[PDB]
Amino acid sequence: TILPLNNIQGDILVGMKKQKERFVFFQVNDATSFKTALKTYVPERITSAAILISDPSQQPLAFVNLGFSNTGLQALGITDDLGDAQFPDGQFADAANLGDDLSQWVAPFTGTTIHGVFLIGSDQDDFLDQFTDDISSTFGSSITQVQALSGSARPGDQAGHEHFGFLDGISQPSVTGWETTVFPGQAVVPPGIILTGRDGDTGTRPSWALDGSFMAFRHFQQKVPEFNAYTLANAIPANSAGNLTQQEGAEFLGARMFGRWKSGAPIDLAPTADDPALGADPQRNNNFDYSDTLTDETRCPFGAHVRKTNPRQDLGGPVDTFHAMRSSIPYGPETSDAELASGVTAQDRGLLFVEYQSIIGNGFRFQQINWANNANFPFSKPITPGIEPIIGQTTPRTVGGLDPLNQNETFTVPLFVIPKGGEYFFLPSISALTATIAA
Numbered sequence: 001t002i003l004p005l006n007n008i009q010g011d012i013l014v015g016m017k018k019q020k021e022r023f024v025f026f027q028v029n030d031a032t033s034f035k036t037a038l039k040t041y042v043p044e045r046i047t048s049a050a051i052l053i054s055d056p057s058q059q060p061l062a063f064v065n066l067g068f069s070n071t072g073l074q075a076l077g078i079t080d081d082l083g084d085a086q087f088p089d090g091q092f093a094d095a096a097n098l099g100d101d102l103s104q105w106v107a108p109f110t111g112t113t114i115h116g117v118f119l120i121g122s123d124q125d126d127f128l129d130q131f132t133d134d135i136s137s138t139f140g141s142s143i144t145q146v147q148a149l150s151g152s153a154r155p156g157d158q159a160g161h162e163h164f165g166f167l168d169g170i171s172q173p174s175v176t177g178w179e180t181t182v183f184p185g186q187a188v189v190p191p192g193i194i195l196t197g198r199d200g201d202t203g204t205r206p207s208w209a210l211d212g213s214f215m216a217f218r219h220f221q222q223k224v225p226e227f228n229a230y231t232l233a234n235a236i237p238a239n240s241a242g243n244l245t246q247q248e249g250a251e252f253l254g255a256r257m258f259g260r261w262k263s264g265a266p267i268d269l270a271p272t273a274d275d276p277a278l279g280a281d282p283q284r285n286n287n288f289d290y291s292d293t294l295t296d297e298t299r300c301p302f303g304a305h306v307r308k309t310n311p312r313q314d315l316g317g318p319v320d321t322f323h324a325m326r327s328s329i330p331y332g333p334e335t336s337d338a339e340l341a342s343g344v345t346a347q348d349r350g351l352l353f354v355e356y357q358s359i360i361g362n363g364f365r366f367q368q369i370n371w372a373n374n375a376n377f378p379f380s381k382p383i384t385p386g387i388e389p390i391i392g393q394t395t396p397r398t399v400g401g402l403d404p405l406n407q408n409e410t411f412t413v414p415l416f417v418i419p420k421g422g423e424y425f426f427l428p429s430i431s432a433l434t435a436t437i438a439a
């Protein structure tokens with residue numbers, strides 16, 4: 001297979017990787033006028049994977065991709081079943097299954113009023129705003145914007161880090177079917193793990209759904225002073241290398257919860273102290289598989305974030321099925337000294353989370369329910385793994401093994417990541433947008 005890179009929406013396969021991103025959630029008011037606008041809009045603005053891998057001199061000043069919810073497709077008379085079990089009912093109907101406190105969800109996510117999302121990525125706000133205004137102008141009264149969520153990479157040396165302080169976007173699957181760089185320890189999977197209708201996809205897809213993907217969007221609010229206070233209050237006293245100062249023990253506890261230090265250094269490789277050079281080196285920072293720690297937790301807890309969401313050798317060998325692409329962006333202001341000192345969140349900040357897969361139930365949803373929320377996953381371990389401390393939702397939120405020298409000790413972790421809403425979208429191929437959606 002040769003993937004048609006010019007026909008695949010770029011955020012799916014390559015990722016926008018822009019400093020700013022805006023998600024414009026909309027409802028369709030006038031299907032005919034929307035379709036008319038779509039036919040002029042798509043060829044001019046919708047950014048392919050081929051454009052994203054091009055030299056920056058050949059790229060537009062902002063990228064745009066577009067996805068539709070089930071109700072958006074129905075509003076447009078696009079009635080063929082896409083073959084996914086969760087997509088038709090929408091994410092609000094699935095939120096309880098995910099473990100969400102529904103009382104924290106907010107409009108307009110609390111139902112299926114949202115018909116779709118334009119995602120706009122750019123390296124500065126001006127261009128982001130111009131391309132957002134271009135959507136408003138092009139589509140006019142054919143849509144109503146029901147929400148816009150805007151994110152930004154964190155400043156300075158925190159660029160690429162999420163709000164708890166951890167480098168994000170290190171580990172992604174690589175799909176066959178195109179020419180790209182594969183790093184040591186990176187999973188290589190058939191393209192149909194990500195792209196509907198391609199090899200590896202077992203879902204029943206209409207022919208027009210070829211080279212689309214499903215997005216799981218989640219709006220997470222993060223409680224950063226609370227996270228930091230918890231790590232200080234539960235600082236690990238010592239590890240194999242020796243005693244830790246409280247500050248060292250708090251940093252170590254955060255790394256034990258994630259499975260990586262803030263620098264990106266994976267604890268499986270750097271189990272006692274950060275190695276910032278390792279974290280920054282993509283030739284090394286993914287080259288582990290837990291094979292050195294399958295039946296003990298000294299090198300890595302069984303329930304650490306990255307281990308729960310990608311179990312690697314905990315599954316017994318490579319497995320294609322449950323990999324997914326992520327293109328998330330932080331949002332909100334930096335956490336002040338006063339906020340950190342008080343231990344109490346005073347400002348809205350978090351993660352606009354985006355995960356792509358051909359089968360929602362095998363990617364995002366499997367990682368969430370079967371793995372993160374599952375106290376007995378990974379399976380067949382000598383100590384109960386417990387609930388993933390970052391995004392596991394089961395209560396009590398008890399996780400074992402965080403202290404490598406007292407692995408039977410359990411930690412009951414307050415929830416620091418609050419789901420505020422989300423939706424399941426389908427992003428068609430670029431040709432499908434005009435030949436099918438806008439027909």
Ligand code: HEM
Pocket residue numbers: 162163164166167168169170171172218220222258260305306307309310324350351353355364365367368372390391417
């Ligand atoms: C605000 C919430 C979240 C934060 C702050 C967060 C943060 C992180 C960080 C720091 C990493 C390590 C960097 C990397 O390996 O790329 C990571 C990895 C990852 N996360 Fe999350 N995450 C969040 C939510 C989620 C959710 C909800 C899921 C899916 C249910 C998820 C799935 C993954 C996956 C698949 C990886 C890569 C694991 C690997 O291949 O080793 N994350 N995340």
Ligand SMILES: *[C@@H]1O[C@H](CO)[C@@H](O)[C@H](O)[C@H]1NC(C)=O
Pocket residue numbers: 237243
């Ligand atoms: C390590 O910490 C313990 C207290 O937990 C203390 O008794 C001991 O003296 C420390 N060891 C070293 C080498 O500093």
